[PDB]
Amino acid sequence: SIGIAVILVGTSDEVAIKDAHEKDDFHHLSVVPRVELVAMNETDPKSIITR
Amino acid sequence: ALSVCEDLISSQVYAILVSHTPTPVSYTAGFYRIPVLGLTT
Amino acid sequence: NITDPPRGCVGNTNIWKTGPLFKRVLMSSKYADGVTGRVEFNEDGDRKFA
Ligand SMILES: *[C@@H]1O[C@H](CO)[C@@H](O)[C@H](O)[C@H]1NC(C)=O
Ligand SMILES: *[C@@H]1O[C@H](CO)[C@@H](O)[C@H](O)[C@H]1NC(C)=O
């Protein structure tokens, strides 16, 4: 369950990233991915680091 | 950098002083383009 | 034609228009009497004739 944190900002289709996110499931992987979904507004480096 | 924003930048700061890579400080100042002079580096 | 840098980090993307000018002043800056004596700067603004 390897974690990966996906992050977007602004107008974007989250359910599409979810779509392709579930679309790919392959035993070719020797480990299962742990899919995560995240979004944010501001570009300020500090708060970016924070989240 | 966290304490630079919260503690420092929030104070409407013209300059900062640094000693000891301390480089992150400059990263912050630079995203703010704010001149800062330390000592020891 | 002077301004002030932003207070809060959040939501502020605009660099302070005068910062570079302030820098150049720091470049031209020559202090005759310091505690350590005279202080100088190079092309990169670094202590010279130390
Ligand atoms: C992002 O911005 C929208 C509107 O611009 C706002 O409703 C939302 O609360 C913001 N996100 C956070 C985490 O505050
Ligand atoms: C910004 O500063 C310049 C330099 O002194 C001066 O022309 C004026 O204060 C401002 N610029 C304009 C076009 O008004």
JSON list of C-alpha atoms and ligand atoms in Angstrom, two decimals:
[
{"chain": "A", "resi": 1, "resn": "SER", "atom": "CA", "xyz": [0.00, 0.00, 0.00]},
{"chain": "A", "resi": 2, "resn": "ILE", "atom": "CA", "xyz": [2.57, 2.52, -1.17]},
{"chain": "A", "resi": 3, "resn": "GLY", "atom": "CA", "xyz": [1.29, 6.05, -0.60]},
{"chain": "A", "resi": 4, "resn": "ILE", "atom": "CA", "xyz": [1.12, 8.64, -3.37]},
{"chain": "A", "resi": 5, "resn": "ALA", "atom": "CA", "xyz": [-0.31, 12.11, -2.79]},
{"chain": "A", "resi": 6, "resn": "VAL", "atom": "CA", "xyz": [-1.93, 13.67, -5.85]},
{"chain": "A", "resi": 7, "resn": "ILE", "atom": "CA", "xyz": [-2.34, 17.44, -5.72]},
{"chain": "A", "resi": 8, "resn": "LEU", "atom": "CA", "xyz": [-4.09, 19.93, -7.99]},
{"chain": "A", "resi": 9, "resn": "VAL", "atom": "CA", "xyz": [-4.91, 23.63, -7.87]},
{"chain": "A", "resi": 10, "resn": "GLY", "atom": "CA", "xyz": [-7.62, 25.64, -9.61]},
{"chain": "A", "resi": 11, "resn": "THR", "atom": "CA", "xyz": [-10.36, 24.47, -11.90]},
{"chain": "A", "resi": 12, "resn": "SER", "atom": "CA", "xyz": [-9.80, 20.81, -12.71]},
{"chain": "A", "resi": 13, "resn": "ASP", "atom": "CA", "xyz": [-11.79, 17.59, -12.90]},
{"chain": "A", "resi": 14, "resn": "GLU", "atom": "CA", "xyz": [-11.16, 15.63, -9.73]},
{"chain": "A", "resi": 15, "resn": "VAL", "atom": "CA", "xyz": [-13.51, 12.79, -10.68]},
{"chain": "A", "resi": 16, "resn": "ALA", "atom": "CA", "xyz": [-11.47, 12.35, -13.87]},
{"chain": "A", "resi": 17, "resn": "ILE", "atom": "CA", "xyz": [-8.24, 11.84, -11.94]},
{"chain": "A", "resi": 18, "resn": "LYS", "atom": "CA", "xyz": [-10.34, 9.45, -9.89]},
{"chain": "A", "resi": 19, "resn": "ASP", "atom": "CA", "xyz": [-11.52, 7.84, -13.13]},
{"chain": "A", "resi": 20, "resn": "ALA", "atom": "CA", "xyz": [-8.07, 7.00, -14.47]},
{"chain": "A", "resi": 21, "resn": "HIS", "atom": "CA", "xyz": [-7.01, 6.42, -10.85]},
{"chain": "A", "resi": 22, "resn": "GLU", "atom": "CA", "xyz": [-9.32, 3.41, -10.50]},
{"chain": "A", "resi": 23, "resn": "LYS", "atom": "CA", "xyz": [-9.03, 2.53, -14.19]},
{"chain": "A", "resi": 24, "resn": "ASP", "atom": "CA", "xyz": [-5.50, 1.14, -13.79]},
{"chain": "A", "resi": 25, "resn": "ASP", "atom": "CA", "xyz": [-5.25, -1.93, -11.56]},
{"chain": "A", "resi": 26, "resn": "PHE", "atom": "CA", "xyz": [-2.44, -4.29, -12.49]},
{"chain": "A", "resi": 27, "resn": "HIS", "atom": "CA", "xyz": [-0.91, -7.30, -10.77]},
{"chain": "A", "resi": 28, "resn": "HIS", "atom": "CA", "xyz": [2.16, -6.35, -12.81]},
{"chain": "A", "resi": 29, "resn": "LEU", "atom": "CA", "xyz": [2.88, -4.20, -9.77]},
{"chain": "A", "resi": 30, "resn": "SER", "atom": "CA", "xyz": [4.69, -6.08, -7.02]},
{"chain": "A", "resi": 31, "resn": "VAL", "atom": "CA", "xyz": [2.93, -3.79, -4.53]},
{"chain": "A", "resi": 32, "resn": "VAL", "atom": "CA", "xyz": [-0.46, -2.11, -4.35]},
{"chain": "A", "resi": 33, "resn": "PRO", "atom": "CA", "xyz": [-0.56, 1.69, -4.63]},
{"chain": "A", "resi": 34, "resn": "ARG", "atom": "CA", "xyz": [-2.28, 3.71, -1.94]},
{"chain": "A", "resi": 35, "resn": "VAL", "atom": "CA", "xyz": [-4.07, 6.42, -3.90]},
{"chain": "A", "resi": 36, "resn": "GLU", "atom": "CA", "xyz": [-4.63, 9.80, -2.27]},
{"chain": "A", "resi": 37, "resn": "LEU", "atom": "CA", "xyz": [-6.43, 12.89, -3.54]},
{"chain": "A", "resi": 38, "resn": "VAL", "atom": "CA", "xyz": [-5.54, 16.43, -2.51]},
{"chain": "A", "resi": 39, "resn": "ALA", "atom": "CA", "xyz": [-6.21, 19.96, -3.73]},
{"chain": "A", "resi": 40, "resn": "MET", "atom": "CA", "xyz": [-5.09, 23.41, -2.65]},
{"chain": "A", "resi": 41, "resn": "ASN", "atom": "CA", "xyz": [-5.51, 27.09, -3.52]},
{"chain": "A", "resi": 42, "resn": "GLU", "atom": "CA", "xyz": [-2.57, 29.26, -2.60]},
{"chain": "A", "resi": 43, "resn": "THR", "atom": "CA", "xyz": [0.92, 29.17, -4.08]},
{"chain": "A", "resi": 44, "resn": "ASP", "atom": "CA", "xyz": [2.64, 30.45, -0.93]},
{"chain": "A", "resi": 45, "resn": "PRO", "atom": "CA", "xyz": [5.58, 28.08, -0.33]},
{"chain": "A", "resi": 46, "resn": "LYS", "atom": "CA", "xyz": [5.10, 28.02, 3.44]},
{"chain": "A", "resi": 47, "resn": "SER", "atom": "CA", "xyz": [1.52, 26.78, 3.47]},
{"chain": "A", "resi": 48, "resn": "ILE", "atom": "CA", "xyz": [2.42, 24.39, 0.66]},
{"chain": "A", "resi": 49, "resn": "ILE", "atom": "CA", "xyz": [5.04, 22.83, 2.91]},
{"chain": "A", "resi": 50, "resn": "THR", "atom": "CA", "xyz": [2.43, 22.84, 5.66]},
{"chain": "A", "resi": 51, "resn": "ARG", "atom": "CA", "xyz": [-0.10, 20.71, 3.80]},
{"chain": "B", "resi": 1, "resn": "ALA", "atom": "CA", "xyz": [10.80, 29.22, 6.62]},
{"chain": "B", "resi": 2, "resn": "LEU", "atom": "CA", "xyz": [7.68, 28.47, 8.64]},
{"chain": "B", "resi": 3, "resn": "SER", "atom": "CA", "xyz": [8.84, 30.70, 11.47]},
{"chain": "B", "resi": 4, "resn": "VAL", "atom": "CA", "xyz": [10.00, 33.12, 8.79]},
{"chain": "B", "resi": 5, "resn": "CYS", "atom": "CA", "xyz": [6.46, 33.69, 7.59]},
{"chain": "B", "resi": 6, "resn": "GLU", "atom": "CA", "xyz": [4.62, 33.27, 10.88]},
{"chain": "B", "resi": 7, "resn": "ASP", "atom": "CA", "xyz": [7.22, 34.81, 13.16]},
{"chain": "B", "resi": 8, "resn": "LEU", "atom": "CA", "xyz": [9.17, 36.96, 10.68]},
{"chain": "B", "resi": 9, "resn": "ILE", "atom": "CA", "xyz": [7.47, 37.94, 7.42]},
{"chain": "B", "resi": 10, "resn": "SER", "atom": "CA", "xyz": [4.17, 38.60, 9.20]},
{"chain": "B", "resi": 11, "resn": "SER", "atom": "CA", "xyz": [5.98, 41.50, 10.90]},
{"chain": "B", "resi": 12, "resn": "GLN", "atom": "CA", "xyz": [6.40, 43.37, 7.58]},
{"chain": "B", "resi": 13, "resn": "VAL", "atom": "CA", "xyz": [10.14, 42.90, 7.75]},
{"chain": "B", "resi": 14, "resn": "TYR", "atom": "CA", "xyz": [12.75, 44.76, 5.73]},
{"chain": "B", "resi": 15, "resn": "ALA", "atom": "CA", "xyz": [15.76, 42.55, 6.51]},
{"chain": "B", "resi": 16, "resn": "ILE", "atom": "CA", "xyz": [16.98, 39.59, 8.56]},
{"chain": "B", "resi": 17, "resn": "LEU", "atom": "CA", "xyz": [20.29, 38.40, 10.00]},
{"chain": "B", "resi": 18, "resn": "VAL", "atom": "CA", "xyz": [21.57, 34.83, 9.88]},
{"chain": "B", "resi": 19, "resn": "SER", "atom": "CA", "xyz": [24.42, 32.64, 11.14]},
{"chain": "B", "resi": 20, "resn": "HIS", "atom": "CA", "xyz": [25.32, 28.96, 11.65]},
{"chain": "B", "resi": 21, "resn": "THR", "atom": "CA", "xyz": [22.94, 24.90, 4.53]},
{"chain": "B", "resi": 22, "resn": "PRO", "atom": "CA", "xyz": [21.34, 28.06, 5.97]},
{"chain": "B", "resi": 23, "resn": "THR", "atom": "CA", "xyz": [20.17, 28.53, 2.36]},
{"chain": "B", "resi": 24, "resn": "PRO", "atom": "CA", "xyz": [16.44, 27.99, 3.07]},
{"chain": "B", "resi": 25, "resn": "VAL", "atom": "CA", "xyz": [16.36, 31.45, 4.67]},
{"chain": "B", "resi": 26, "resn": "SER", "atom": "CA", "xyz": [17.51, 32.92, 1.39]},
{"chain": "B", "resi": 27, "resn": "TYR", "atom": "CA", "xyz": [14.98, 30.76, -0.44]},
{"chain": "B", "resi": 28, "resn": "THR", "atom": "CA", "xyz": [12.28, 32.49, 1.56]},
{"chain": "B", "resi": 29, "resn": "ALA", "atom": "CA", "xyz": [13.72, 35.98, 1.23]},
{"chain": "B", "resi": 30, "resn": "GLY", "atom": "CA", "xyz": [14.04, 35.35, -2.49]},
{"chain": "B", "resi": 31, "resn": "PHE", "atom": "CA", "xyz": [10.50, 34.23, -3.13]},
{"chain": "B", "resi": 32, "resn": "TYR", "atom": "CA", "xyz": [9.90, 37.54, -1.40]},
{"chain": "B", "resi": 33, "resn": "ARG", "atom": "CA", "xyz": [12.98, 39.07, -3.08]},
{"chain": "B", "resi": 34, "resn": "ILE", "atom": "CA", "xyz": [13.72, 40.69, 0.29]},
{"chain": "B", "resi": 35, "resn": "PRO", "atom": "CA", "xyz": [17.38, 41.55, 0.98]},
{"chain": "B", "resi": 36, "resn": "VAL", "atom": "CA", "xyz": [18.76, 39.85, 4.08]},
{"chain": "B", "resi": 37, "resn": "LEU", "atom": "CA", "xyz": [22.27, 39.92, 5.54]},
{"chain": "B", "resi": 38, "resn": "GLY", "atom": "CA", "xyz": [23.65, 37.38, 7.98]},
{"chain": "B", "resi": 39, "resn": "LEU", "atom": "CA", "xyz": [27.15, 36.82, 9.25]},
{"chain": "B", "resi": 40, "resn": "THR", "atom": "CA", "xyz": [28.89, 33.51, 9.36]},
{"chain": "B", "resi": 41, "resn": "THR", "atom": "CA", "xyz": [28.40, 31.84, 5.97]},
{"chain": "C", "resi": 1, "resn": "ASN", "atom": "CA", "xyz": [7.80, 55.99, -4.99]},
{"chain": "C", "resi": 2, "resn": "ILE", "atom": "CA", "xyz": [7.99, 53.73, -1.97]},
{"chain": "C", "resi": 3, "resn": "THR", "atom": "CA", "xyz": [5.85, 50.81, -0.81]},
{"chain": "C", "resi": 4, "resn": "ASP", "atom": "CA", "xyz": [5.83, 48.20, 1.94]},
{"chain": "C", "resi": 5, "resn": "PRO", "atom": "CA", "xyz": [6.37, 44.45, 1.62]},
{"chain": "C", "resi": 6, "resn": "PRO", "atom": "CA", "xyz": [3.41, 42.18, 2.37]},
{"chain": "C", "resi": 7, "resn": "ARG", "atom": "CA", "xyz": [2.51, 41.19, 5.91]},
{"chain": "C", "resi": 8, "resn": "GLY", "atom": "CA", "xyz": [1.00, 37.72, 5.55]},
{"chain": "C", "resi": 9, "resn": "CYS", "atom": "CA", "xyz": [2.62, 35.10, 3.36]},
{"chain": "C", "resi": 10, "resn": "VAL", "atom": "CA", "xyz": [-0.68, 33.52, 2.41]},
{"chain": "C", "resi": 11, "resn": "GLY", "atom": "CA", "xyz": [-2.36, 34.81, -0.73]},
{"chain": "C", "resi": 12, "resn": "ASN", "atom": "CA", "xyz": [0.45, 37.20, -1.68]},
{"chain": "C", "resi": 13, "resn": "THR", "atom": "CA", "xyz": [2.17, 36.36, -4.96]},
{"chain": "C", "resi": 14, "resn": "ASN", "atom": "CA", "xyz": [3.59, 39.78, -5.79]},
{"chain": "C", "resi": 15, "resn": "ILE", "atom": "CA", "xyz": [7.20, 40.57, -5.05]},
{"chain": "C", "resi": 16, "resn": "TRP", "atom": "CA", "xyz": [7.86, 43.95, -3.52]},
{"chain": "C", "resi": 17, "resn": "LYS", "atom": "CA", "xyz": [8.50, 46.22, -6.46]},
{"chain": "C", "resi": 18, "resn": "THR", "atom": "CA", "xyz": [11.37, 48.15, -4.88]},
{"chain": "C", "resi": 19, "resn": "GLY", "atom": "CA", "xyz": [13.40, 45.27, -3.44]},
{"chain": "C", "resi": 20, "resn": "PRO", "atom": "CA", "xyz": [16.02, 45.25, -6.18]},
{"chain": "C", "resi": 21, "resn": "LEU", "atom": "CA", "xyz": [16.50, 49.00, -5.80]},
{"chain": "C", "resi": 22, "resn": "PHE", "atom": "CA", "xyz": [17.00, 48.60, -2.06]},
{"chain": "C", "resi": 23, "resn": "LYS", "atom": "CA", "xyz": [19.59, 45.99, -2.97]},
{"chain": "C", "resi": 24, "resn": "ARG", "atom": "CA", "xyz": [21.44, 48.33, -5.31]},
{"chain": "C", "resi": 25, "resn": "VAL", "atom": "CA", "xyz": [21.53, 50.88, -2.51]},
{"chain": "C", "resi": 26, "resn": "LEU", "atom": "CA", "xyz": [23.09, 48.18, -0.36]},
{"chain": "C", "resi": 27, "resn": "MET", "atom": "CA", "xyz": [25.63, 47.78, -3.16]},
{"chain": "C", "resi": 28, "resn": "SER", "atom": "CA", "xyz": [26.52, 51.47, -3.31]},
{"chain": "C", "resi": 29, "resn": "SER", "atom": "CA", "xyz": [26.58, 51.46, 0.49]},
{"chain": "C", "resi": 30, "resn": "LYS", "atom": "CA", "xyz": [29.94, 52.50, 1.94]},
{"chain": "C", "resi": 31, "resn": "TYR", "atom": "CA", "xyz": [30.31, 52.81, 5.71]},
{"chain": "C", "resi": 32, "resn": "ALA", "atom": "CA", "xyz": [33.31, 54.90, 6.75]},
{"chain": "C", "resi": 33, "resn": "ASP", "atom": "CA", "xyz": [33.27, 54.01, 10.46]},
{"chain": "C", "resi": 34, "resn": "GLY", "atom": "CA", "xyz": [32.32, 50.55, 11.64]},
{"chain": "C", "resi": 35, "resn": "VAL", "atom": "CA", "xyz": [33.26, 48.59, 14.71]},
{"chain": "C", "resi": 36, "resn": "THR", "atom": "CA", "xyz": [35.48, 46.48, 12.48]},
{"chain": "C", "resi": 37, "resn": "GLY", "atom": "CA", "xyz": [36.29, 49.56, 10.41]},
{"chain": "C", "resi": 38, "resn": "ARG", "atom": "CA", "xyz": [35.48, 50.27, 6.78]},
{"chain": "C", "resi": 39, "resn": "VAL", "atom": "CA", "xyz": [33.24, 47.82, 4.93]},
{"chain": "C", "resi": 40, "resn": "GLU", "atom": "CA", "xyz": [33.09, 47.20, 1.18]},
{"chain": "C", "resi": 41, "resn": "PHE", "atom": "CA", "xyz": [31.34, 45.02, -1.38]},
{"chain": "C", "resi": 42, "resn": "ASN", "atom": "CA", "xyz": [32.18, 43.29, -4.65]},
{"chain": "C", "resi": 43, "resn": "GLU", "atom": "CA", "xyz": [30.29, 42.76, -7.90]},
{"chain": "C", "resi": 44, "resn": "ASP", "atom": "CA", "xyz": [28.25, 40.26, -5.90]},
{"chain": "C", "resi": 45, "resn": "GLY", "atom": "CA", "xyz": [28.17, 42.67, -2.97]},
{"chain": "C", "resi": 46, "resn": "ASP", "atom": "CA", "xyz": [30.72, 40.90, -0.80]},
{"chain": "C", "resi": 47, "resn": "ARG", "atom": "CA", "xyz": [33.17, 42.35, 1.70]},
{"chain": "C", "resi": 48, "resn": "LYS", "atom": "CA", "xyz": [36.20, 43.64, -0.19]},
{"chain": "C", "resi": 49, "resn": "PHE", "atom": "CA", "xyz": [39.59, 44.98, 0.86]},
{"chain": "C", "resi": 50, "resn": "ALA", "atom": "CA", "xyz": [38.98, 43.18, 4.14]},
{"chain": "D", "resi": 1, "resn": "LIG", "atom": "C1", "xyz": [-10.08, 27.62, -1.83]},
{"chain": "D", "resi": 1, "resn": "LIG", "atom": "O1", "xyz": [-10.79, 28.71, -2.41]},
{"chain": "D", "resi": 1, "resn": "LIG", "atom": "C2", "xyz": [-12.21, 28.54, -2.43]},
{"chain": "D", "resi": 1, "resn": "LIG", "atom": "C3", "xyz": [-12.77, 29.74, -3.16]},
{"chain": "D", "resi": 1, "resn": "LIG", "atom": "O2", "xyz": [-11.73, 30.47, -3.81]},
{"chain": "D", "resi": 1, "resn": "LIG", "atom": "C4", "xyz": [-12.72, 28.43, -1.00]},
{"chain": "D", "resi": 1, "resn": "LIG", "atom": "O3", "xyz": [-14.13, 28.21, -1.00]},
{"chain": "D", "resi": 1, "resn": "LIG", "atom": "C5", "xyz": [-12.02, 27.28, -0.29]},
{"chain": "D", "resi": 1, "resn": "LIG", "atom": "O4", "xyz": [-12.41, 27.25, 1.08]},
{"chain": "D", "resi": 1, "resn": "LIG", "atom": "C6", "xyz": [-10.51, 27.45, -0.38]},
{"chain": "D", "resi": 1, "resn": "LIG", "atom": "N1", "xyz": [-9.84, 26.31, 0.22]},
{"chain": "D", "resi": 1, "resn": "LIG", "atom": "C7", "xyz": [-9.52, 26.25, 1.52]},
{"chain": "D", "resi": 1, "resn": "LIG", "atom": "C8", "xyz": [-8.83, 25.00, 1.97]},
{"chain": "D", "resi": 1, "resn": "LIG", "atom": "O5", "xyz": [-9.78, 27.17, 2.29]},
{"chain": "D", "resi": 2, "resn": "LIG", "atom": "C1", "xyz": [7.99, 55.68, -9.51]},
{"chain": "D", "resi": 2, "resn": "LIG", "atom": "O1", "xyz": [9.26, 56.22, -9.11]},
{"chain": "D", "resi": 2, "resn": "LIG", "atom": "C2", "xyz": [9.90, 56.98, -10.15]},
{"chain": "D", "resi": 2, "resn": "LIG", "atom": "C3", "xyz": [11.32, 57.23, -9.71]},
{"chain": "D", "resi": 2, "resn": "LIG", "atom": "O2", "xyz": [11.40, 58.33, -8.81]},
{"chain": "D", "resi": 2, "resn": "LIG", "atom": "C4", "xyz": [9.11, 58.26, -10.39]},
{"chain": "D", "resi": 2, "resn": "LIG", "atom": "O3", "xyz": [9.02, 58.49, -11.79]},
{"chain": "D", "resi": 2, "resn": "LIG", "atom": "C5", "xyz": [7.72, 58.16, -9.79]},
{"chain": "D", "resi": 2, "resn": "LIG", "atom": "O4", "xyz": [7.79, 58.35, -8.38]},
{"chain": "D", "resi": 2, "resn": "LIG", "atom": "C6", "xyz": [7.10, 56.79, -10.08]},
{"chain": "D", "resi": 2, "resn": "LIG", "atom": "N1", "xyz": [6.91, 56.61, -11.51]},
{"chain": "D", "resi": 2, "resn": "LIG", "atom": "C7", "xyz": [5.98, 57.26, -12.22]},
{"chain": "D", "resi": 2, "resn": "LIG", "atom": "C8", "xyz": [5.95, 56.96, -13.68]},
{"chain": "D", "resi": 2, "resn": "LIG", "atom": "O5", "xyz": [5.19, 58.05, -11.70]}
]
